[PDB]
Amino acid sequence: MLKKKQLTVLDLHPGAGKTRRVLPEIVREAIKKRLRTVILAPTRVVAAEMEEALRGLPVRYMTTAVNVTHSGTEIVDLMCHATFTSRLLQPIRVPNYNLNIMDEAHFTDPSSIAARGYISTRVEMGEAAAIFMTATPPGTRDAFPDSNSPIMDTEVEVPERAWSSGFDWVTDHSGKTVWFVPSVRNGNEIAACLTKAGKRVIQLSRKTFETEFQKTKNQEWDFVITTDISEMGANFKADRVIDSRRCLKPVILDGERVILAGPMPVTHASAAQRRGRIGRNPNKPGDEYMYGGGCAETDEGHAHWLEARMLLDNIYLQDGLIASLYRPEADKVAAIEGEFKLRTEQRKTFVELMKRGDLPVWLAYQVASAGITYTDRRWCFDGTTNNTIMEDSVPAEVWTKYGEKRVLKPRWMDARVCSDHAALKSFKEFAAGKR
Numbered sequence: 417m418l419k420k421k422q423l424t425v426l427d428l429h430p431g432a433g434k435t436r437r438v439l440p441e442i443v444r445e446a447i448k449k450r451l452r453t454v455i456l457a458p459t460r461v462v463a464a465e466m467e468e469a470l471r472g473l474p475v476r477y478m479t480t481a482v483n484v485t486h487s488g489t490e491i492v493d494l495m496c497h498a499t500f501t502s503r504l505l506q507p508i509r510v511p512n513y514n515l516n517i518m519d520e521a522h523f524t525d526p527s528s529i530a531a532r533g534y535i536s537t538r539v540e541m542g543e544a545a546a547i548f549m550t551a552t553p554p555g556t557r558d559a560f561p562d563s564n565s566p567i568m569d570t571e572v573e574v575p576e577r578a579w580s581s582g583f584d585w586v587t588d589h590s591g592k593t594v595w596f597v598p599s600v601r602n603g604n605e606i607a608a609c610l611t612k613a614g615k616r617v618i619q620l621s622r623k624t625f626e627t628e629f630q631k632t633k634n635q636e637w638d639f640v641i642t643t644d645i646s647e648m649g650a651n652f653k654a655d656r657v658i659d660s661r662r663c664l665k666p667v668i669l670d671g672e673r674v675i676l677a678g679p680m681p682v683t684h685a686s687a688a689q690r691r692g693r694i695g696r697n698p699n700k701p702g703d704e705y706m707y708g709g710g711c712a713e714t715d716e717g718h719a720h721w722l723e724a725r726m727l728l729d730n731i732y733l734q735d736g737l738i739a740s741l742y743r744p745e746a747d748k749v750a751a752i753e754g755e756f757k758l759r760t761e762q763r764k765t766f767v768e769l770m771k772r773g774d775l776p777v778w779l780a781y782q783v784a785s786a787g788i789t790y791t792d793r794r795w796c797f798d799g800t801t802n803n804t805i806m807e808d809s810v811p812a813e814v815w816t817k818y819g820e821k822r823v824l825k826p827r828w829m830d831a832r833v834c835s836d837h838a839a840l841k842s843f844k845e846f847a848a849g850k851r
């Protein structure tokens with residue numbers, strides 16, 4: 417695998433040992449061959465699991481998720497997918513790694529897609545080797561891959577709202593269930609219904625994942641209600657997955673606004689990763705996968721691939737050259753390589769709106785490309801009446817940095833800034849000048 421100009425897809429089935437058995441063998445061989453190596457974890461939770469798998473090997477943990485005193489002599493670096501892309505975008509030297517290892521390489525967040533595009537372009541240039549570790553590479557069509565033990569697959573109507581009757585099988589179960597929902601708001605309603613029925617529920621989403629995931633180890637629970645973030649190498653001691661088989665799709669309308677379309681079917685890759693949370697113990701056959709819909713290739717036209725192009729257009733590669741998306745995922749967007757390349761000061765603004773502003777890539781791009789500076793929040797208030805953000809069926813209001821109460825009416829509307837109470841709270845703080 418370790419030869420320059422090689423990209424290997426390590427596509428062993430979920431639970432086959434890619435992280436705990438194969439990765440340490442790859443790292444030992446890379447160190448023997450003096451390959452400057454990066455290992456990319458999708459989440460801080462996976463970063464910590466990797467430290468355990470790699471313990472004693474000379475690896476530099478570029479993450480506060482691990483508390484280890486480093487020698488200063490490591491040639492292997494470990495960081496999150498997002499950290500890799502972030503450092504490429506910033507005016508910081510990222511080593512030209514000889515070997516690029518991406519764990520949970522199916523991750524479809526924009527920074528992960530961009531990282532794959534940059535890495536696969538360096539490999540195509542003859543500059544580097546790469547290993548993408550995933551059971552479900554891009555365009556996989558198999559929702560039911562092999563497992564460590566047999567899975568009971570059942571197509572069944574799955575509730576997406578509170579229920580009073582007609583789903584006894586949900587609550588009649590005595591084991592532990594991981595339940596994939598399409599949104600935080602949908603999980604909140606199901607979680608409340610289960611809580612009312614006497615169940616112990618933990619909810620996981622991107623913003624809460626590290627903190628709340630620890631509760632799955634520290635407390636007894638009956639259900640984990642999770643969004644798609646638990647597709648990325650989250651492991652549970654569970655005997656059932658309930659899968660809505662639904663997700664939200666960010667869609668850019670008319671180059672002008674982003675909506676969260678759906679819920680709509682998941683991809684085959686997502687369905688396989690959701691299912692792959694169970695059947696992992698060869699000694700515990702008959703784990704259950706209850707699924708409530710079909711699969712479809714809903715990554716086609718999904719904003720994350722256009723956002724990945726916005727990131728890659730703003731990463732230096734060589735002179736004016738621009739990294740391509742990884743070939744198998746390159747048709748998911750209609751985009752011209754370089755169309756989103758920003759001049760130096762607008763690029764800095766773009767980066768800060770993502771890094772400090774915590775804005776979605778698309779929205780950060782609209783603001784930066786309009787020639788607005790990072791601290792200028794006038795655009796949060798001067799949109800059309802139809803861009804009014806609503807909070808409990810009334811227009812959201814904030815005090816501006818000038819001390820004026822105004823309706824939140826952003827010039828560019830991206831549904832991700834108000835997808836749930838926590839998102840809208842964060843965006844209100846942004847509009848107010850509080851970060």
Ligand SMILES: CC(=O)c1cccc(NC(=O)N2CCOCC2)c1
Nearest residue numbers: 476477478479480481484485486499
């Ligand atoms: C984003 C982030 O957390 C980050 C970013 C850059 C560097 C590091 N830390 C290191 O380079 N390590 C670990 C600490 O002490 C020895 C060297 C962490």
